[PDB]
Design an enzyme around this catalytic site. Sequence first.
Site, mmCIF file in Angstrom:
data_model
loop_
_atom_site.group_PDB
_atom_site.id
_atom_site.type_symbol
_atom_site.label_atom_id
_atom_site.label_comp_id
_atom_site.label_asym_id
_atom_site.label_seq_id
_atom_site.Cartn_x
_atom_site.Cartn_y
_atom_site.Cartn_z
ATOM 1 N N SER A 41 0.796 -1.222 0.000
ATOM 2 C CA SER A 41 0.000 0.000 0.000
ATOM 3 C C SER A 41 0.833 1.279 0.000
ATOM 4 O O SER A 41 0.257 2.362 -0.152
ATOM 5 C CB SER A 41 -0.933 0.017 1.215
ATOM 6 O OG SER A 41 -1.972 -0.943 1.102
ATOM 7 N N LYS A 44 0.631 4.399 -2.295
ATOM 8 C CA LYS A 44 -0.529 5.290 -2.254
ATOM 9 C C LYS A 44 -0.145 6.706 -1.839
ATOM 10 O O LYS A 44 -0.826 7.663 -2.222
ATOM 11 C CB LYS A 44 -1.601 4.725 -1.318
ATOM 12 C CG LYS A 44 -2.362 3.535 -1.915
ATOM 13 C CD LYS A 44 -3.222 2.809 -0.887
ATOM 14 C CE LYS A 44 -3.720 1.489 -1.471
ATOM 15 N NZ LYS A 44 -4.087 0.515 -0.418
ATOM 16 N N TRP A 76 -11.095 -3.896 1.577
ATOM 17 C CA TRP A 76 -10.389 -2.838 2.313
ATOM 18 C C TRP A 76 -10.586 -1.463 1.664
ATOM 19 O O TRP A 76 -9.631 -0.797 1.258
ATOM 20 C CB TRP A 76 -8.892 -3.144 2.458
ATOM 21 C CG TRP A 76 -8.481 -4.075 3.566
ATOM 22 C CD1 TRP A 76 -8.616 -3.863 4.911
ATOM 23 C CD2 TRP A 76 -7.783 -5.320 3.427
ATOM 24 N NE1 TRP A 76 -8.080 -4.917 5.613
ATOM 25 C CE2 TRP A 76 -7.561 -5.824 4.726
ATOM 26 C CE3 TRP A 76 -7.346 -6.070 2.329
ATOM 27 C CZ2 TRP A 76 -6.916 -7.040 4.956
ATOM 28 C CZ3 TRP A 76 -6.705 -7.274 2.559
ATOM 29 C CH2 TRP A 76 -6.499 -7.749 3.862
ATOM 30 N N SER A 101 -5.472 3.841 3.570
ATOM 31 C CA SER A 101 -5.063 2.855 2.574
ATOM 32 C C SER A 101 -6.248 2.335 1.768
ATOM 33 O O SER A 101 -6.262 1.176 1.345
ATOM 34 C CB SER A 101 -4.312 1.691 3.225
ATOM 35 O OG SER A 101 -2.988 1.619 2.750
ATOM 36 N N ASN A 103 -8.507 1.047 -0.848
ATOM 37 C CA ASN A 103 -8.110 0.447 -2.120
ATOM 38 C C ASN A 103 -8.971 0.922 -3.288
ATOM 39 O O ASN A 103 -8.443 1.200 -4.370
ATOM 40 C CB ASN A 103 -8.145 -1.080 -2.009
ATOM 41 C CG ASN A 103 -6.933 -1.628 -1.274
ATOM 42 O OD1 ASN A 103 -5.819 -1.138 -1.451
ATOM 43 N ND2 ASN A 103 -7.149 -2.620 -0.422
ATOM 44 N N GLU A 139 -3.986 -7.030 -6.952
ATOM 45 C CA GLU A 139 -2.947 -7.940 -7.442
ATOM 46 C C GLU A 139 -1.542 -7.421 -7.152
ATOM 47 O O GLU A 139 -0.599 -8.212 -7.062
ATOM 48 C CB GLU A 139 -3.091 -8.181 -8.950
ATOM 49 C CG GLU A 139 -4.515 -8.282 -9.464
ATOM 50 C CD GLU A 139 -5.084 -6.928 -9.866
ATOM 51 O OE1 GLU A 139 -4.460 -6.236 -10.705
ATOM 52 O OE2 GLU A 139 -6.154 -6.558 -9.341
ATOM 53 N N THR A 206 2.061 3.629 5.327
ATOM 54 C CA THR A 206 2.381 2.237 5.590
ATOM 55 C C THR A 206 2.094 1.367 4.369
ATOM 56 O O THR A 206 1.462 1.784 3.396
ATOM 57 C CB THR A 206 1.584 1.719 6.785
ATOM 58 O OG1 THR A 206 0.185 1.956 6.565
ATOM 59 C CG2 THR A 206 2.006 2.448 8.035
ATOM 60 N N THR A 208 1.265 -3.101 3.854
ATOM 61 C CA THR A 208 1.178 -4.426 4.471
ATOM 62 C C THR A 208 0.613 -5.377 3.419
ATOM 63 O O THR A 208 -0.605 -5.434 3.233
ATOM 64 C CB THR A 208 0.299 -4.400 5.716
ATOM 65 O OG1 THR A 208 0.695 -3.326 6.574
ATOM 66 C CG2 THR A 208 0.389 -5.719 6.469
HETATM 67 C C1 IM2 Z 1 -1.724 -2.222 1.659
HETATM 68 O O1 IM2 Z 1 -0.636 -2.505 2.030
HETATM 69 C C2 IM2 Z 1 -2.883 -3.245 2.000
HETATM 70 C C3 IM2 Z 1 -3.526 -3.814 0.677
HETATM 71 C C4 IM2 Z 1 -4.413 -5.007 0.975
HETATM 72 O O2 IM2 Z 1 -4.267 -2.855 0.001
HETATM 73 C C5 IM2 Z 1 -3.825 -2.616 2.866
HETATM 74 C C6 IM2 Z 1 -4.089 -3.439 4.187
HETATM 75 C C7 IM2 Z 1 -3.805 -2.573 5.229
HETATM 76 S S1 IM2 Z 1 -4.957 -2.354 6.620
HETATM 77 C C8 IM2 Z 1 -4.037 -2.403 8.190
HETATM 78 C C9 IM2 Z 1 -2.620 -2.931 7.954
HETATM 79 N N1 IM2 Z 1 -1.844 -2.874 9.184
HETATM 80 C C10 IM2 Z 1 -1.035 -1.715 9.537
HETATM 81 N N2 IM2 Z 1 -0.965 -0.714 8.788
HETATM 82 C C11 IM2 Z 1 -3.097 -1.357 4.693
HETATM 83 C C12 IM2 Z 1 -2.107 -0.525 5.504
HETATM 84 O O3 IM2 Z 1 -2.517 0.491 6.124
HETATM 85 O O4 IM2 Z 1 -0.890 -0.846 5.558
HETATM 86 N N3 IM2 Z 1 -3.166 -1.283 3.370
#
Ligand code: IM2
EC number: 3.5.2.6
Length: 260
Positions: A41, A44, A76, A101, A103, A139, A206, A208
């Site tokens: 993510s 972004k 998400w 984050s 999507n 993806e 962030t 993840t």
């Molecule tokens: C991005 O890295 C993912 C992807 C599935 O779009 C999403 C999931 C998470 S939600 C909480 C994650 N834990 C700590 N941050 C995020 C994100 O905020 O990293 N983006």
Amino acid sequence: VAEPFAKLEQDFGGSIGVYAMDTGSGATVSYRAEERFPLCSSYKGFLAAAVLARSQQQAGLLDTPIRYGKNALVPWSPISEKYLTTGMTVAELSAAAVQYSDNAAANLLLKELGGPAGLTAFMRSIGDTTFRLDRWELELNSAIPGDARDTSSPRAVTESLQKLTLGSALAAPQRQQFVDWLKGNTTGNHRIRAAVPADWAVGDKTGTCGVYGTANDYAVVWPTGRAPIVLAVYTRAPNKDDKHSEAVIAAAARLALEGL
Ligand SMILES: *C(=O)[C@H]([C@@H](C)O)[C@H]1CC(SCCNC=N)=C(C(=O)O)N1
């Protein structure tokens, strides 16, 4: 220097990539700073930056309402889902992409830019030759070893963040909007933010991926009455079910900041 990170990445079971830059002194810390890691993510943040850069050429872009169908929703999308019946402006989608984050918001903004190639074209425009976004949500989060798609390096991420939050790449008002969005991020309290004193301002984004122990964080830090610090911490792991660790990201970030 590198010794504490090797130690850390062997308690973690995978690779840690770290790059930090003191914009005043010019001091840096590098550990696997030139290796590729999945963005997850974290692209972004640069997406929002690219949207801001385009609004410099396209007045009223930020206020443009984007009215989407239920089809635009992907897993998400907590903000995007709430406004399905009214839509959201480009600026609102950008804040949602950065701070939650979201999507669906990211895919909508990617579309505005001409897809993943459009975002990569923006990163090239500011001199980033490492960044590549190739795929859409979700993806791009596959994080498969050896895949160069949807990756960058800690150093390239840091330099681009520097150019965008402190340098001339964004015009003055867009630059402050970008910083404000990073400062209001809601997902990074346990990563780089956890390594700085609470009296220092931090903006971060962030990532993840959810697989292959792949997670990350990049940030701009303002130490009180001090030149700002820019840093990026990226991780990955060889097994698909390997767990990422926010603690490892914060520990790596502390080693970087205690070392500048
Ligand atoms: C991005 O890295 C993912 C992807 C599935 O779009 C999403 C999931 C998470 S939600 C909480 C994650 N834990 C700590 N941050 C995020 C994100 O905020 O990293 N983006």
